[PDB]
Swiss-Prot record, chains A, B:
Disease annotated for this entry: Immunodeficiency 31B: A disorder characterized by susceptibility to severe mycobacterial and viral infections. Affected individuals can develop disseminated infections and die of viral illness.
Gene label: STAT1
Residues recorded with modification Phosphotyrosine: Y109
Cross-link Glycyl lysine isopeptide (Lys-Gly) (interchain with G-Cter in SUMO1) residue location(s): K111
Effect of K111R: Abolishes sumoylation by SUMO1. Increased IFN-gamma-mediated transactivation
Result of altering L114S: In IMD31A; loss of GAF and ISGF3 activation; impairs the nuclear accumulation of GAF but not of ISGF3 in heterozygous cells stimulated by IFNs; affects phosphorylation of the protein
Chain's role: Signal transducer and transcription activator that mediates cellular responses to interferons (IFNs), cytokine KITLG/SCF and other cytokines and other growth factors. Following type I IFN (IFN-alpha and IFN-beta) binding to cell surface receptors, signaling via protein kinases leads to activation of Jak kinases (TYK2 and JAK1) and to tyrosine phosphorylation of STAT1 and STAT2. The phosphorylated STATs dimerize and associate with ISGF3G/IRF-9 to form a complex termed ISGF3 transcription factor, that enters the nucleus.
Annotated localization: Cytoplasm; Nucleus
Sites bearing ADP-ribosyl glutamic acid, chain numbering: E79, E113
Effect of S118A: No effect on transcriptional activation of ARID5A
Family the UniProt entry places it in: Belongs to the transcription factor STAT family.
Consequence the record notes for mutating Y109E: Not phosphorylated at S-116 upon IFNB induction
Organism: Homo sapiens
The protein's name in its UniProt record: Signal transducer and activator of transcription 1-alpha/beta
Length: 119, 119
């Protein structure tokens, strides 16, 4: 969607599964930086404070593609299994369908790949 | 340690805590690419198959610094807390000492990092 105001975004995420997420451009870049936004359940019986991510410039994207960021988003803790709070894109589309086709790929060194993680 | 043969490496890692690691430069790139090597306990009452990682070249290091790879190395699973097999550098030196001093740093956007991860 790229361009949308951080007002009519919230008011378009009072949709669905605590786990829908926009694609936005950031307005506060000078390098032009893409981002996403997603939504939870807060227990108060309503909308979340919602959630967005520090926007991904070329720097990061040089080193790993946008899709692949998403696939493997975490969020973490000290000693808790890590979440993946990304299920459905805009209306209802399973992550691993929209961006399926863009994923890269799927005595002996051990295989690493990069990963963006919060907290 | 840079330069060493993958013979007198193993035979100098029958030192210590299942959790020591050198630094090595890789012999098998042309691009020049550093790597690390570390050791476990296999339960058989001896040395591990040991472990070393796919070599980290410029590309990767462009994006996030080598030290910072170290700090936050993972290894993961489906639904298991993620480990940190790097504790002691060569003879006995706590990770968070050797490479302390190079670490970078320690409605409202949420802070992301990059991180290197296996499995």
């Amino acid at each position: 969607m790229g361009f949308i105001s951080k007002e009519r975004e919230r008011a378009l995420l009072k949709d669905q599964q605590p786990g829908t997420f926009l694609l936005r451009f950031s307005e506060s870049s000078r390098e032009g930086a893409i981002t996403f936004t997603w939504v939870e359940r807060s227990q108060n019986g309503g909308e979340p404070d919602f959630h967005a991510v520090e926007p991904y410039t070329k720097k990061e994207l040089s080193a790993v593609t946008f899709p692949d960021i998403i696939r493997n988003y975490k969020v973490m803790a000290a000693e808790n299994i890590p979440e993946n709070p990304l299920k459905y894109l805009y209306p209802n589309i399973d992550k691993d369908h929209a961006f399926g086709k863009y994923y890269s790929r799927p005595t002996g060194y051990i295989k690493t790949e990069l990963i963006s993680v919060s907290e």
